[PDB]
RNA sequence: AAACUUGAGUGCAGAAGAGGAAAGUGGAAUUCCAUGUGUAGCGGUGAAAUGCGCAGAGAUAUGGAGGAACACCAGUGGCGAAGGCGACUUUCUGGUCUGUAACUGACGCUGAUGUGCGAAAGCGUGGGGAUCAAACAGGAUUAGAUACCCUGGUAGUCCACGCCGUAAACGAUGAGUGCUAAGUGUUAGGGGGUGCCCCUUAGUGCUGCAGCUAACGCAUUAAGCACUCCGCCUGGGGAGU
């Protein structure tokens, strides 16, 4: 899966996790606030994936295409710290889905009516 | 032996035959077993110095209530923040 | 549920306190009664690591 | 709650009633109440088609409200009066207009209290509206299966319903037995849970009780003859001597399932039964 | 009986105790699956791992989920009786303490009301059984080990509602003494007045010397000697029968 880069950015208050995955779910590397080693609440900062990404797209060696698709979720101090982090990393970031675990719990049955 | 200092503060738009059993309910549950008070007061029209929940007045009756059961500045606390009764009161543990 | 400050908080923990760093005066805030008790907390609180100086 | 007998009898040693206490008035409205025929397990033909069906107490049907199409009036609860011909306690509720009929009490219901109906009602126990106006995680009974026809589902004692979603053309619920299912959201449902949960907690101890109710003896199908039931003749007590059990009409009644195939609400069913 | 005192009574001014957070919007998981450290990933062995179709089959950065919901403020805390709290968070509940005495004045037995309070299996377990986990499939030796290890795997651990009772409750170690070395910490709060001289000591960690105890060992909180009922060894036994 070369050429291609579907990472999903995770921003917490503890343990900010942002791999990049290939298109298909496959990961192709594994750097972040796991392989970094801050007990300090540290790693879910501004500067947590900056760094945690830091190696995991740079030593990739496979994917790192130009697009990312940073899926953001959740809030946490730095969420805005991962978006650019990928643009800081050597690619970029333009596609962003801002939808994080809040379900407004609304659905519809039938129609054909008002 | 242990004093309390209650400054409480009403709601500003409250009917004086409301605010007479509003205040019964008060000293009901400070003069408890007991008033053992000093002197009671009944501050009117004024303006405070500080803001809170940008209100436009509030009657004023604070009244000085030593106590050794320690059973007057209890209720009066949980009734500033459950019910919309009481807006500011105050913890003065001072003799 | 209540408007409370949280522990990450660090500079909300010397913001009506004397030079020294020690027990704050009644006359000296401008709030609500009710916030004289977070006050007493973000000393107690900052009293441990010695991040706020006993005697400045 | 539940009140005990003292053992001064054989037939009292074991015997459990129930201590009406919810129940307000005893008397019912005379002008909401029809006579009953009792069939008793008989058809137009005559013959016995059901069995365990006797006579028992005479007992008289109070016309019940399960549609509930009386929006914007308001109505205040007068009285619980016990019903025999159901298992929940029914409450008479008083409008405006001229309607007064009685409605499935609720558990938490209490005498002198308003109840509304419509799309515009709060959501109050007692109060009866669309259920797409009634927000999801919401416990609900006395459900309807088609606008505008009147509630069948969740009316025992202590039976409710609890609203999860609304999958695209139907609402999902969760029912009593463990089993979700899609259901138009366009029909009514009462909020809240039935009443008398303690109907299940009753013994009725005398075997002369159980004809009060009106159900005759129930005569085992291995002690019958050949000629009457499959597992009839047999020197002394044997056993069934079959590879299962068969009912008195010779049909398989352990495991084998009935429910008819290609239905037109088979695809509204989401999970079975647990 | 006439009488005043602080050192103790509520604790007189102290500070961390919020005597106590069960917690909806919540977002992070072993399972199905939207669809991924998505197919060797994990529950995974003193040597010894079991687990995930055979007529159709797991791996969790996630996501559409969390529990008995919650990592940090839970501290040689105040401890008032064996008994120190949360995804910040609210309740003052008798109440216990060191330097201090506002108030009357008057000084004992870990105490006859030992409420039979009392880890623990069993008790009012409402609910309970899930990464799982006894047993169980098991895997393993060498001249010797269904053990234990781990594992798919029932129970086994869980909340208000008479109630629930042996302890390493006493580290096999309960009991009113002091005084001929200094202190007296704890969580963090306090003066003489600047924290330099002081701060006796207790709720708690206790520091050895006169004298005892056959010795071991008790001493600014001896078992020397001036203050309570108690009290244990009696045939080793038998006998805790």
């Known amino acids: 899966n070369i050429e291609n880069g579907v990472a999903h950015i995770r921003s917490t208050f503890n343990n900010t996790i942002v791999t990049i995955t290939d298109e298909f779910g496959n990961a192709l590397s594994w750097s972040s606030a796991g392989a970094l080693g801050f007990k300090g609440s540290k790693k879910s900062t501004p500067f947590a994936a900056q760094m945690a990404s830091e190696t995991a797209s740079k030593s990739a060696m496979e994917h790192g295409l130009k697009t990312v698709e940073v899926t953001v979720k959740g809030p946490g101090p ?11 990393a050597g690619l ?23 | ?47 405070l110095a500080y803001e809170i929940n940008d ?8 009244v000085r209530v030593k106590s050794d059961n320690n059973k007057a500045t209890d209720e009066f606390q949980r009734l500033a923040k459950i019910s919309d009764d009481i807006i500011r009161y105050m913890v003065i543990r001072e003799d | 549920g209540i408007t409370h400050i949280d522990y990450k908080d660090t500079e909300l923990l010397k913001r009506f306190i004397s030079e ?21 907390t973000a000393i107690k609180r900052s009293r441990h690591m010695a991040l706020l100086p006993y005697v400045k | ?27 019912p409205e005379k002008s909401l109440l029809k006579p009953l025929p009792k069939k008793a397990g008989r058809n137009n033909q005559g013959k016995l088609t059901v069995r365990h069906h006797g006579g028992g107490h005479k007992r008289q049907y109070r016309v019940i409200d399960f549609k509930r199409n009386k929006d914007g009036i308001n109505a205040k609860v007068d009285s ?9 306690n029914i409450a008479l509720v008083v409008y405006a207009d001229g309607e007064k009929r009685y409605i499935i009490a609720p558990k938490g219901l209490e005498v002198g209290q308003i109840v509304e109906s419509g799309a515009e009602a709060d959501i109050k126990v007692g109060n009866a509206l669309p259920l797409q106006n009634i927000p999801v995680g919401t416990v609900v009974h006395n459900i309807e299966l088609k606008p505008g026809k009147g509630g069948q589902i969740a009316r025992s004692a202590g039976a409710s319903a609890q609203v999860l979603g609304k999958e695209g053309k139907y609402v999902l619920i969760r029912l009593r037995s463990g089993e979700v299912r899609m259901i138009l959201s366009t029909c009514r449902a009462t909020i809240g849970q039935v009443g008398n949960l303690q109907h299940e907690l009753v013994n009725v101890g005398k075997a002369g009780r159980s004809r009060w109710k009106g159900i005759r003896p129930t005569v085992r199908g291995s002690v019958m003859n050949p000629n009457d039931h499959p597992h009839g003749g047999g020197e002394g007590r044997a056993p069934i001597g079959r590879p299962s059990p068969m009912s008195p009409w010779g049909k398989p009644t352990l495991g084998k399932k009935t429910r008819r195939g290609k239905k037109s609400s088979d695809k509204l069913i989401v999970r079975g039964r647990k």
């Open chain 2, 1 to 47: 032996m242990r004093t309390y200092e209650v400054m409480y503060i009403v709601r500003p738009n409250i009917e004086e035959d409301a605010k007479k059993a509003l205040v019964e309910r008060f000293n009901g549950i400070l003069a408890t077993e007991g008033a053992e008070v000093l002197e009671a007061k009944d501050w009117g029209k004024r303006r």
């Open chain 4, 80 to 88: 619980i009066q016990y019903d025999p011909n159901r298992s929940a």
């Open chain 1, 78 to 88: 730095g969420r805005e710290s991962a978006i650019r982090a990928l643009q800081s």
């Open chain 3, 20 to 40: 020294r760093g020690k027990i704050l005066p009644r006359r000296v805030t401008g709030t609500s009664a009710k916030y004289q008790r977070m006050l007493t």
């Open chain 4, 1 to 27: 709650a539940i009140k005990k007998y003292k053992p001064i009898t054989n037939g009292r040693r074991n015997m459990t009633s129930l201590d009406f206490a919810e129940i307000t008035k005893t008397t």
């Open chain 1, 92 to 114: 970029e970031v333009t596609a962003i889905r801002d939808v994080t675990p809040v379900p407004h719990n609304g659905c519809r049955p039938p129609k054909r009516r008002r």
């Open chain 2, 55 to 62: 209100f436009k007045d509030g009657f004023y009756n604070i």
